[PDB]
Amino acid sequence: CPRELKILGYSFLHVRDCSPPCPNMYFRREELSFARYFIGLISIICLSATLFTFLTFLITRFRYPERPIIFYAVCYMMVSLIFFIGFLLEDRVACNASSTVTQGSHNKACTMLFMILYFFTMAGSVWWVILTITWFLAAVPKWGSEAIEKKALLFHASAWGIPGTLTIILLAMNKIEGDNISGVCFVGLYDVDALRYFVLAPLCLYVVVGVSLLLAGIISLNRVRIEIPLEKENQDKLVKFMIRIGVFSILYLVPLLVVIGCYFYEQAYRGIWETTWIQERCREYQVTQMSRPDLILFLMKYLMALIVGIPSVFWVGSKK
Amino acid sequence: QVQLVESGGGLVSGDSLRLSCTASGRIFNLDVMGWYRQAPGKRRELVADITSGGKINYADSVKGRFTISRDNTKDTVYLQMNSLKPEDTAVYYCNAEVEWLDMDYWGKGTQVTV
């Protein structure tokens, strides 16, 4: 085992200390070479699209009920920014040289990136969920732009506090984890329990709550487009707003459903990458571990994890 | 809804003058609701906006002369035009808005003369 102590210990594979190898960690070398182009070629362009939104935002009576979109854009802007470490340095310190080599829990060479990626990833989801609640108010309630803004400190409290505590709960006795050569410090890439408990579950609960209240908002407006006929001109004028919510919600809920699918795939897969490592390790290399999903699944994993923030552009471009 | 509170202006106020507007056909929370003029001229200009209890905003050439208020259980915006001189001659329009949906409500039927 290329580790013997945290030079917890550093114990990953059912042991006092060990660490899975950095090259050919899971997959074939070839696909890493084109991920080296592709992860950036999608992430930096997604970041370029997302930064324009914040640029326009920094410049229609009030923005109180559309406010969470700004912080959504900021959050996934940062997510894309620190995925841009995919080929930014053209060095891979986060897989430290032979030094906590694979990835160092409780050492600087990894922690400086997980605490931002996980934090902003959770923050963006909470921003979308409370954007759903923001639209829930002033759709079925009788609440105004100023009245909803009066809860803004509670909204910021929840939105920046849930990610804060979910990070606070990942010190020595908890799980800060590594990355592939195409990756940056993040939790759960090698440990299934970290994924199952403190990644997959929050995303699922957020998406569920959003669907709940998003539908109980859109079809709560449904009772108004018809069933009060005196000012027709808004029909197919307020339609632009409803259809914009719908398009935004599709373009958001697609990637999260897909990534939850990918994590459910890994929660039923990684159990066999190991049970056969007893038969691919003890040398260099159920009957096979991975297949064509060697890219076509873990590639759309990162693709959807980055294009969660794309709804911002088709939201802002429909209001000009 | 507006009511015509008119006589001819004062017929050249006497001691004061007020307008009222009131909305009973509503769905969403009227955020900003106020008044607009027209000379009769090529434009319809702003007078005074209220934003549900705050941010009263008078006209950039007329500020510091009028007053505006609002009730909330009854969606009534008021405008008292004290120290009135003729160039206030205009057919006035009460206005209301909901922001996020971008729906604008206009009333009809009020005129002041001198």
Numbering used by the authors:
A (entry chain A): 165 to 171, 175 to 226, 229 to 267, 275 to 461, 468 to 502
B (entry chain B): 1 to 12, 17 to 118
Task: Please quote the paper that reports this structure.
The Wnt receptor Frizzled3 (FZD3) is important for brain axonal development and cancer progression. We report structures of FZD3 in complex with extracellular and intracellular binding nanobodies (Nb). FZD3, together with the closely related FZD6, forms a distinct subset within the Frizzled family, which has been reported to signal exclusively through non-canonical Wnt pathways, without eliciting β-catenin-dependent signaling. To develop FZD3-specific modulators and build a structural framework for potential therapeutic interventions, here we show a panel of FZD3 specific nanobodies and the structures of the FZD3 CRD and full-length FZD3 in complex with two high-affinity nanobodies.
We engineered Nb9 into a megabody by fusing Nb9 with the bacterial α-galactosidase (YgjK scaffold) to facilitate a high resolution single-particle cryo-EM analysis. For a similarly fused megabody (with a nanobody targeting Hedgehog acyltransferase) the fusion has been demonstrated to have little effect on binding affinity. This scaffold increased the size of the FZD3-containing complex by an additional ~100 kDa, enabling us to determine the FZD3-Nb9 megabody structure at a global resolution of 2.9 Å. Although the weak extracellular density (even after the improvement with 3DFlex reconstruction) is not sufficient for confidently modelling the FZD3 CRD structure, the presence of CRD in this region is a certainty. Given the conformational similarity between FZD3 and FZD7, our structure suggests that FZD3 may possess a similar activation mechanism to FZD7. Nb9 binds to the cytoplasmic region of FZD3 in a pocket formed by the intracellular parts of the TM helices and their intracellular loops (ICLs). For example, W100 from the tip of Nb9 CDR3 is deeply embedded in the FZD3 pocket, forming a π-π stacking interaction with W3113.50, as well as hydrophobic interactions with F4176.39, P2342.40, and A3153.54 of the FZD3. The predicted binding surface on FZD3 overlaps with the Nb9 epitope. This experiment shows that Nb9 can block interactions between DEP domain and FZD3.
